[PDB]
Design a protein around this nucleic acid. Sequence first.
RNA 1: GGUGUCCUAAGGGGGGCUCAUGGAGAACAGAAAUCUCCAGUAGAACAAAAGGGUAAAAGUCCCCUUGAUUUUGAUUUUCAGUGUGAAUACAAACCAUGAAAGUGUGGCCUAUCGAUCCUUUAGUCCCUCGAAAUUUGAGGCUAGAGGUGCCAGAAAAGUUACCACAGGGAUGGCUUGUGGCGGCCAAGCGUUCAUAGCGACGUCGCUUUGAUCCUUCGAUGUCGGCUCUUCCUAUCAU
RNA 2: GAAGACCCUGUUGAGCUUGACUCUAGUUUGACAUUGUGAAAAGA
RNA 3: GCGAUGGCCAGAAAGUGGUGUUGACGCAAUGUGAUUUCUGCCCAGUGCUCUGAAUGUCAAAGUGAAGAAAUUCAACCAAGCGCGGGUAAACGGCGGGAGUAACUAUGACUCUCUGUAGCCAAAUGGA
RNA 4: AGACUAAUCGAACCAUCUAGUAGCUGGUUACCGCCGAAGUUUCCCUCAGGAUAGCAGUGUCGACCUUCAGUUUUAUGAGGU
Lengths: 65, 285, 125, 125, 51
Amino acid sequence: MFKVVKTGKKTHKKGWKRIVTKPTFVGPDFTRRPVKYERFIRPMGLRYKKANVTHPTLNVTVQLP
Amino acid sequence: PRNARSKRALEKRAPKIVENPKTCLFLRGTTCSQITQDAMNDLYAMRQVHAKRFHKKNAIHPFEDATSLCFFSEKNDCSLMVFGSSNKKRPHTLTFVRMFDYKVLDMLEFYLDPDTYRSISQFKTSKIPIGMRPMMVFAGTAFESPVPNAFTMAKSMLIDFFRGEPSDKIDVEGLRFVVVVTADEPQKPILRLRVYGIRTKRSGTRLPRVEVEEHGPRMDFRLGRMREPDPAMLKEAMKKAKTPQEERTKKNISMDLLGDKIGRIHMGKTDLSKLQTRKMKGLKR
Amino acid sequence: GTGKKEKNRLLREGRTPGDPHVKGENFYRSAKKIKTLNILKEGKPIRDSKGKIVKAASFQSKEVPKAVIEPNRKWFTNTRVISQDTLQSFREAMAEKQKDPYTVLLKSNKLPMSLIRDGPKLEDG
Amino acid sequence: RQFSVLHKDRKQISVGLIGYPNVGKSSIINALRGKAVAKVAPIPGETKVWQYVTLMKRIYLIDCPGIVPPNQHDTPEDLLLRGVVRVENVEHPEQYIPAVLRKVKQHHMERTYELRGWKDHIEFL
Amino acid sequence: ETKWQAFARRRGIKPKTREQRRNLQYNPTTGQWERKWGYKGANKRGETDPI
RNA sequence: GGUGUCCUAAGGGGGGCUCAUGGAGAACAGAAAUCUCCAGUAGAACAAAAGGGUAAAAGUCCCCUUGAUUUUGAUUUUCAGUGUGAAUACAAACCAUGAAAGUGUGGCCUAUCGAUCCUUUAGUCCCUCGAAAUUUGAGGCUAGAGGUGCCAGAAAAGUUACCACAGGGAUGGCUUGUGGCGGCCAAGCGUUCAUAGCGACGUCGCUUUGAUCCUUCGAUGUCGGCUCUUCCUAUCAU
RNA sequence: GAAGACCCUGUUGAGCUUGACUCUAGUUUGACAUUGUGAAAAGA
RNA sequence: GCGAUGGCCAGAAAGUGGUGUUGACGCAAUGUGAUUUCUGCCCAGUGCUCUGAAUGUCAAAGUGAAGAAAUUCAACCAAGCGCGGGUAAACGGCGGGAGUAACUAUGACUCUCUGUAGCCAAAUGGA
RNA sequence: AGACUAAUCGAACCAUCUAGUAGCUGGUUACCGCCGAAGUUUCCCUCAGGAUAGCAGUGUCGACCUUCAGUUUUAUGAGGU
Ligand SMILES: Nc1nc2c(ncn2[C@@H]2O[C@H](COP(=O)(O)OP(=O)(O)OP(=O)(O)O)[C@@H](O)[C@H]2O)c(=O)[nH]1
Ligand SMILES: [Mg+2]
Ligand SMILES: [Mg+2]
C-alpha cells in the first residue's frame, strides 16, 4: 500500500514519509498538509471524484460523483 | 434499574435540557368540604392528561410541614400539587404547591367563595375536548406590581397550571376556549377565574368577530397565606437551558441560505496619503 | 527551592503518582510533542546481525490482512434523503444568491446540486 | 490574521504567493517577515522552487516561481515589456525600443536620458 | 470525572470509534463472522467443542 | 458466593388469559401430584423500597422482529500532526410491531502491574540477644487478617556531516496490438430421475456542425555527452 | 595506502547537548568556635 | 555588570598571584557589524527583578513534654520555593473599533468594519 | 578553521598498569582401527531469548531375567463411502 519517500541531503536518508500507491478520494474542501507534517502523501494524479456505477435492477450504468 | 422498563422510567424522571410538561397531583386533607372537592374536580377536568389524583385522606398541614408533599412529589414525579382543606377559619381552601427538585419552591393559598361557585356541569354548553390547551387572558392591575406579590405568584402558578404542552405550531381550529383571570389592586381583592367558549362571526373584514359563551367553572378566590422561594433556589429554578439546536453565535461566522459556512473579512479604508512615490529621474524638472 | 529533578517537577506540577510516561519527557517536552518529534525519527526497520528485517518499519508491515466485508442491513438503505420543500427552498436560494467579495467560503454544504442549480439554456440544450 | 482566526480549527494556514515573474512575490514575503528570508533579484526567474517561511506561529508563506499563462494573443514584445525574459538573451533588442517609446511619455525619456531631438528609435539609440 | 476518564485525559487516550468497538469479528479458520462476547461469544470459545 | 448443566440472546410491539389461597368434589391420590366448580383488591409474580407500583396489566402464555448497537447534521461539549473529521449530546429520517390510535430500540462499564507481592496483628505456656538476672527493645520461628480509596510502590534523555573500532554485505523460454465493470445473445461443452452451470464470436450501457485556447494536477527510483566497433529487424530512405 | 567510500550489526568506543540519572567546583543561607569588656531595657 | 572590605580572573593552598604603574572618556562580558536606510501595532503567558506581607514548604543547631532510658512526640523554624507587586517587555502571544447589566483581574453580551506625476515633511524621501 | 601545539590533535608524545576486554575475524601440528549424529518434543514476554525432550560414545553391573516388534492376521472402532 505505502512506499517509502526518502528525505535529506546525506547518503543515509530519513524514511518517515509514506506515499499511497492506490487511487484515493480526498473529499470536498481539501487542502493538503504542510510538507513538514505530511506523513501520508496522496498524489493529485491518483485522486478520483467520479465512478461508473451500475444499477443491477434497472440495468443502467451512470457516471456518478 | 436492572429491568428495561424501570430504566425507561428512570430516564423519564431524569433531568433534561427540554423538560417534560409538569404533572399536577390533586389531593385533599383529612377534612375537606364538598365545594372544595368540586373545585378540585373541575381543575382536574381542565387538566386531565397531566394530572394524577389521590383518593385517601392525608393528615398534612402544608404551612407547618411539607415533608410528605416532598415525598409524594418524589414518588409520583409530580411537580405541582393542588391540595384541598377546610377549617373553621378557612372553610374552602385550595393550596397551590409548586416544587423544584422534589423540594418546595413556593406555595399559595386560595380561599374559594362558596356562594358564587358554579361548576362546569351548571352551564349547558359544549365543553372543551380532552387534552386541548385553552388560551389565557390575565386582566386587571393586580398583576403589574413592581414588587413580587401574591397576585404575581398566583398569575405565575395559573399560567403554569393551564399552559399545557408547548408546541411550535397550532391548528386554527384549536382556538375555541379561553381562560380569563381578572384581579385589581386595592378590602381584600378578589381573583376571579372564568372559562369561556369562543365563536366567530362575519364582520365584513378579514378578521372575524369574536363572541364568547360561558363554559365554566366560575370561581372567586381571595389570596391567603404565601410561601416565597429561597432566593438561591429561585435563581437555580429560573436558570434557562440552551438546546443543542440553538447555535452559539461565532464572530464573523455565518450560515448562508444554502447551508455553507461563510466567513467575513474586513479590509479597512485604503489610505495612500502617507505613501511617498519613488522620486525618479524622469519625473524631475 | 524544590529541585530540578523529574520527581520534583512532577510533584511541583501536581501530576498523579504512578502514571506512565513516554521516554524523553522533560520540562520542554510533553507526550504529544514527543510523538510529533519521534515521527521524524521513524522509518527505520529493526534488523538482525545479518541484515534480515525482524521487525518492519512503520506502515511497512508486509502482513496480508483478511479483506472481508460483513453482511449488514445498512449497505442497502439510503444514506442521504431530501424533501421537495427543502429542494424548493434551496432552488429559491440558488436563484437569489449574489456575489460578495468580502465574504469567503469556509465549509461547503453537501447538497444534491444537480437537483438545485438551474438547467442549461434553451439554445445550448 | 483574520484568515487565521477564521481557520482557527486547523493548526495553521498557508498563504501561497502567485503571479508573473518579477512582480515582487519574494519581496512581499521579505517585507511581511521583516527580514531577507527569500532571494530577491531584478532578473526574472530568481525563485525556482517553492519555499516555506514561518511568518507567525499559525501563518505560513509559500514562495513560488513565476508563471506565464500561455495566450495566443500575447506577443514576445508583450512578454518582454511585462518582464518575463532576460533581455541579455534576446536577439535584435532594438526592435522592442519603439514599443517602449510608445509606452513612455516623450518628455519622461528626455529628462531620463538628458537627450532630445530624435525622430525615430534608431536615431534615439 | 471517573478514574479512567481522568487517566485517559492525562495520557491523551482517544475514545474508540463505534466501528472499532463493534461486537463482531471475522474468524479466519472457520471463515465466519462471530461476536467477541455475549451469547456464543468468542470469549467462551471451546466450551461447547467436542474435544 | 462455589461447582456442574441448558438455551433461535435480551429487548420491543400486538393479542388472549388471570394470580396466591380457601371451601366442596374426582381410581390409585393418601396434609402434600393432576382435574372441576364456587369464593377470592391482588394478600401471587415482577419491579422498587409508598405514607396510594402494576389486573381485559407493568403479571403470565402465544404471534412477529431479533438487524449484537443504523443514517444525516452547516448544531452542543471535548478532542484531533492520520482535519473524506472522531467521540459525544440533541434533532430528524429510518427500523420493529399493531387494523389503528400509537408504542419502542438503535448498549453498560473501566488505567495497568505484584499474590513466591504489599500492609498489618498475636505468641501468654515458643527460641535467642553468647559472664548472670529483671524490665524495655530487637531478631528468628509459628499462627492470623485485608487486597492498590486506608496495600507500599512503579521518571536512567538525546546527537554526531568532526568522528572511531570489530565484523558482515552490496523476476527471468520474462516480454509485444487491440480497457475495465455490468447486462444480453450465442455455435458449442454439459444436462437430460435435477434444466442448472461453463461458453468463443459479438453486442449494448458508462467513461465539437471541424470547438476551445481563462483548468500544464507532486523526483524514493536519474540520466548524459565524447570517441569507436559490431549485431538485430520490429524498414525511415534507397 | 579500494582492508577506500556506502549500507547493516554491536555488552561497541569517543566527542557534544539538555529540568535524562547520580554526584560536584563555584555561589548563597543558617549554626557552632575564633569572641573579649561595660551599660540600658524586655522575660524568668 | 563593577565606586575597592569591589568586579573579572587564576591557584591544591598560602602573610598567593593577575587585571593594577588600574578608577566609569575605565575595565570586563555580550550581540550587531562602514555609511545611508531602519524600528507593523498592543500587551503581560514564560521569563527579568521587588528584603512587600506571610509562615504555607521549611534542614542543621537550639527549646519543651512523656518515659527508667534508648527513644518518641510537640511547637519554633533561614535562604530558596510558594503567595502577592513592577518589567529587558527579551522570548512570546496579538483582526480591529464601540458600548454597557458585570463592575478589580479573566470580563461576558450585543453592535458594525471593506498626479503622465500629488500632498506633506529639514536638498532629500534612500537598501 | 576544532585550526595549531616537532610529518602525531574532536585531545600531543614517552613509559607503566597490561599478556586490559571481545560474544567478532583469522589460525590451531603423526598414522591406523572401532562406533557415530541432529533442526518448534514440551514449557516458559519477545527480539540482542532460554532451558528441555529426542538422537550418540565410552565404561560397568544385574540371572544379558523377563522376551519384545514403525509388520500381518483375528475381534472391534473410524471411514457405511
Ligand atoms: N520600486 C519597487 N520595486 C520593487 C518593489 N517590490 C519588488 N521590487 C523589485 O522588483 C524586483 C523583483 O523582485 P522579486 O522579489 O524577485 O519578485 P519575484 O516575482 O519573486 O521574482 P522571481 O523570483 O523571478 O519570481 C526586485 O528587484 C525588487 O527590487 C516595490 O514595491 N517597489
Ligand atoms: Mg526576480
Ligand atoms: Mg522570487
